Amino acid sequence: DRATWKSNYFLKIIQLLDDYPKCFIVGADNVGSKQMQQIRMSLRGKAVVLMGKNTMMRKAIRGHLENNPALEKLLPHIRGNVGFVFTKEDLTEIRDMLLANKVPAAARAGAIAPCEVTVPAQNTGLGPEKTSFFQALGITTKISRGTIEILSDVQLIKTGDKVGASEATLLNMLNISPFSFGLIIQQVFDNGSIYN
Amino acid sequence: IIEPSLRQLAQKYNCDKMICRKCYARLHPRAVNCRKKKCGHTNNLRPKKKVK
Amino acid sequence: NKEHVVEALRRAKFKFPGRQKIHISKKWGFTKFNADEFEDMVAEKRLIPDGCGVKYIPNRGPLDKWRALHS
Amino acid sequence: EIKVVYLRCTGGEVGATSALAPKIGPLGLSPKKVGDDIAKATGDWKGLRITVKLTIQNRQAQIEVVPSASALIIKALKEPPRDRKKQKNIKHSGNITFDEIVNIARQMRHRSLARELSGTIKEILGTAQSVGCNVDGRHPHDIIDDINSGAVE
Amino acid sequence: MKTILSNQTVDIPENVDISLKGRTVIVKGPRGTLRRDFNHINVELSLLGKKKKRLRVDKWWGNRKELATVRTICSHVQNMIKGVTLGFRYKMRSVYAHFPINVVIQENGSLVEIRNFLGEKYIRRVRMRPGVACSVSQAQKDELVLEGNDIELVSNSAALIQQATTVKNKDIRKFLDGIYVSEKGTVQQA
RNA sequence: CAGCAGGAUGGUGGCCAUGGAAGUCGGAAUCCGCUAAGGAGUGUGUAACAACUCACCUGCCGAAUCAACUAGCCCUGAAAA
Ligand SMILES: [Mg+2]
Ligand SMILES: [Zn+2]
């Protein structure tokens, strides 16, 4: 219940103090349920999983403040949930190579857009429908012989602009997605060192 | 003849309630005690009978 | 099964008049003996199980029952 | 044109109403001949809806068999299947042979979605408890029945 | 028991300057002023800070019956600031099955006639509360939007045309008619 | 301890099963296997799935819950010419 794995971490604490001196300090947004997925084949032996809870995020780390003792500064670092997915081998190409297997989304009202959103020059594959979603927001769509085609390459959300709600039906009717969803790696920590 | 959303809107104010077993009043659906005095804040409650 | 006998007797309370109380004993079963003491005494062979009850062996009676208990 | 299609064929049971018209139909090739030869290529399952893969090519659609491990559990468990009558309290049971633990492995190594012959002693119990059989107790009793007291590679 | 002290504070944004003379507060800003007197509650209203950047309210030596009055004034003040900066807009639909519901506004937003309800020839001369300006919606088939600033004058007058049109002597699991309330919102948006 | 919260099924689409059900239909059963997460689903939906959320679990702050004494006063219980 709420008593059963509560006492087994403070036995299995040390099993990874003395083994694995290398973490990729990933920042936890949208770790999804449908989009962390088509990835396997880059990460076979470079990785681990074990517990972590905010309730002992203090207690067993201060119990660990004693083996290699310059070991305090993480707590103002993780402002949220930031998982330290370990690694073993490479110094730079696992900082690198977690980039090559991700699969993007359906155009959703609800995410954030930090960069430019582009809308392609492509037909919708449908008949006579309502053009008010293209002709009230500022996109040139015209009826093209049953089919509806995006006339000019109209961009929606530029570099650092928030996502509007009622502007997703054009890429959803095209089934084509702005950018690759997945999980973002945030920080670096290597052997008594920090970067930003 | 009727939209099933506006109808979901009109089931809320008329047909999702909880009824006392003592004074036959009509309470909001997440309630545990009657708000009256002539029954004594009794904890006998039922759902309202759905349509047949 | 202790949390269903309070519930059975909470209902049996609606047939009798007056007022009465439900009490969980400190004995073992339908005996007159205590809770923990019972297993150390059965273990040192002072008490004998007889179905619903138990018999007490003193140090007073003659010896042949003692030998018929140890042997 | 290469289109590997998912179909839920009824195996050795020649079906009455299949699921072939909204999936393969609008391509142009007829799925009526194939629904029978696939049950023929099944043969001795006859009970089980092992899903059969079909790959539509430019000439025709091919037939591929996709092996399992929980349907090799139904291979290790050889019970009488039932007819159309379809009556409850159906959930089969039995005794799985300890060398059928070996032989379901020797056909769930072609898929190879697991570990080896000594790493086979969960697959035939923990879903086998939802299909319906036990090897002397479920996975919780076959914890101490299987922990490091084996002689199987 | 007797609890010795309980307080609560409210931050105010800088489009609004507030003050108080005694116990009645006044709040003026982009859409007008509002005044509400709290002279039946017996607490202490203190307004700390240069530029008046937040408020604080206390109650000394109070039981359980009057620790309730710490938050339910902070709410009628956050509502006092919202009804001056933003302003309220209640949207309410109009369900009907077979006959047409006719809705007509008299007095430039300050009166509502209602016709043809369940075939009743009896018009309903519903009056608003002074402060609230009704309107028929746009870009929607059947909809009213009530606008105003004071929420107390808005919501009671909104519920008046909800109780004006009821059903006599029949089922209300089957006879589902009336002008019901859909969405509680503000005039403009932050 | 409430909720302005990031999501829940690649073996299988359980066995024999429903015509079609993949958890969203019936049955002895009800598990442990990267599993901070198994439920052959608490559930909606769909001819079935697809698309969803949730039992159990993962984000943001400065002190609570289950029964039981009717334990004291107060109220309902409580109808006359
Ligand atoms: Mg009548
Ligand atoms: Zn009542």
E26 strand-pairing partners: E19, E35
What residues in E contact B7, CB-CB < 8 Å? 95, 176
Q: What's the alpha-carbon Rg for chain C, to the nearest Å?
A: 18
Burial class (CB in 10 A: 0-12, 13-18, 19+), D15: middle
Contacts of residue A31, defined as CB under 8 A and 6 or more positions apart, other chains included, come to A183
Spatial contact of D108 and D147, defined as CB atoms under 8 Å apart: no
Alpha-carbon distance E161 to nearest alpha carbon in chain B (angstroms): 14
CA atoms D137, D143, D149, D151: torsion sign:
positive
Any atom of strand F under 7 A from CB of D93?
yes
Q: How many CB atoms lie within 10 A of CB A9?
A: 16
Please, are residues C22 and C10 in contact by the beta-carbon 8 Å criterion?
A: yes
Residue A169 in tokens: 């039906």
- Alpha carbon dihedral D64, D67, D73, D74, in 10-degree steps, equals 0
Alpha-carbon distance B1 to nearest alpha carbon in chain E (angstroms): 6
Tokens of E67: 């620790």
Evaluated on CA atoms A29, A33, A34, A37, the torsion sign reads positive
What is residue A40's DSSP assignment? Answer: G
Return the structure tokens found at A31. 């770790």
Residue E151 and residue E153: Cα distance in Å, rounded?
Answer: 5
Q: Is A125 left (phi over 0), alpha (psi -120 to 50) or beta?
A: left
CA A39 from centre of chain:
13
- In Å, how far from its chain's centre is CA A15? 28
Please state, in angstroms and rounded to a whole number, the distance separating the CA atoms of residues C47 and A157.
88
Contacts of A144 (CB under 8 A, 6+ apart): A123
Sequence-distant (6+) residues with CB within 8 A of E170 are none
Where is chain C discontinuous (C–N over 2.5 Å), named by the preceding residue?
A: none
Distances from the Cα of E176 to the Cαs of C6, C40, C66, E171, E179, in angstroms? Answer: 48, 75, 90, 9, 10
Question: For chain E, what is the radius of gyration of the CA atoms?
Answer: 21
Q: Is E140 on the interface with B (CB under 8 A)?
A: no
Q: Touching check for B1 and chain E: CB below 8 Å?
A: yes
| Backbone dihedral angles phi then psi of residue A166, each to the nearest 5 degrees | -90, 20
Residues 6+ apart with CB under 8 A from A194: A73, A187, A188
Question: Cβ of C40: how many Cβ atoms within 10 Å?
Answer: 9
Q: Measured in whole angstroms, how far is the alpha carbon of residue A31 from the centre of its chain?
A: 6
Q: What was the elucidation method?
A: cryo-EM
- A82 forms beta bridges with A27
Radius of gyration of chain A (CA): 23
Residues of B in contact with E165 (CB under 8 A): none
Tell me whether residue A79 is exposed, middle or buried, using C-beta atoms within 10 angstroms of its C-beta: 0 to 12, 13 to 18, 19 or more. exposed
Rg (CA), chain B: 13
Per DSSP, the three-state class of E92 is strand
Give me B29's structure tokens.
């659906």
What is d(CA E148, CA E131) in angstroms, rounded to the nearest whole number? 6
Q: Does B16 touch chain E (CB under 8 A)?
A: no
Q: CA torsion sign, A185 to A190 to A192 to A195?
A: negative
**Residue numbers in B near E163 (CB within 8 A):** none
Nucleotide with the nearest C1' to D93 CA: F28
Q: Could you tell me which of A148, A104, A145 has the C-alpha nearest to residue A123? A: A148
* Nearest by Cα to D37 from D4, D11, D75, D67: D11
Could you give the CA distance from residue A47 to residue A37 in angstroms, rounded to a whole number? Answer: 16
Six-digit token pair at A139? 């996109």
Distance CA C22, CA C8 (A): 10
E95 and B CB contact within 8 Å: yes
- H or E segment and range at residue B10: helix B4-11
For every residue of chain A, which 3-state class applies, written as one string? CCCCCCCCHHHHCHHHCCCCCCEEEEECCCCCCCCCCCCHHHCCCCCCCCCCCCCCCCHHHHCCCCCCCCCCCCCCCCCCCEEEEECCCCCCCCCCCCCCCCCCCCCCCCCCCCCCCECCCCECCCCCCCCHHHHCCCCCEEEECCEEEECCCCECCCCCCCCCHHHCHHHHHHCCCCCCCCCCCCEEECCCCCCC
With a CB cutoff of 8 Å and minimum separation 6, the contacts of B20 are: B27, B34, B36, B39, B42, B44, B45
Interface test with B, best of E93, E173, E177 (most B CBs within 10 A): E173
Strand partners, E63: none
Within 8 A by CB and 6+ apart from A33, the residues are none
Total residues belonging to chain C = 71
Rounded distance between C-alpha atoms, residue D64 and residue E41, angstroms:
81
Instruction: State phi, psi for D142 to the nearest 5 degrees.
Output: -80, 10
Q: What is the resolution of this structure in A?
A: 3.8
D76 sits within 7 Å of strand F by its CB? no
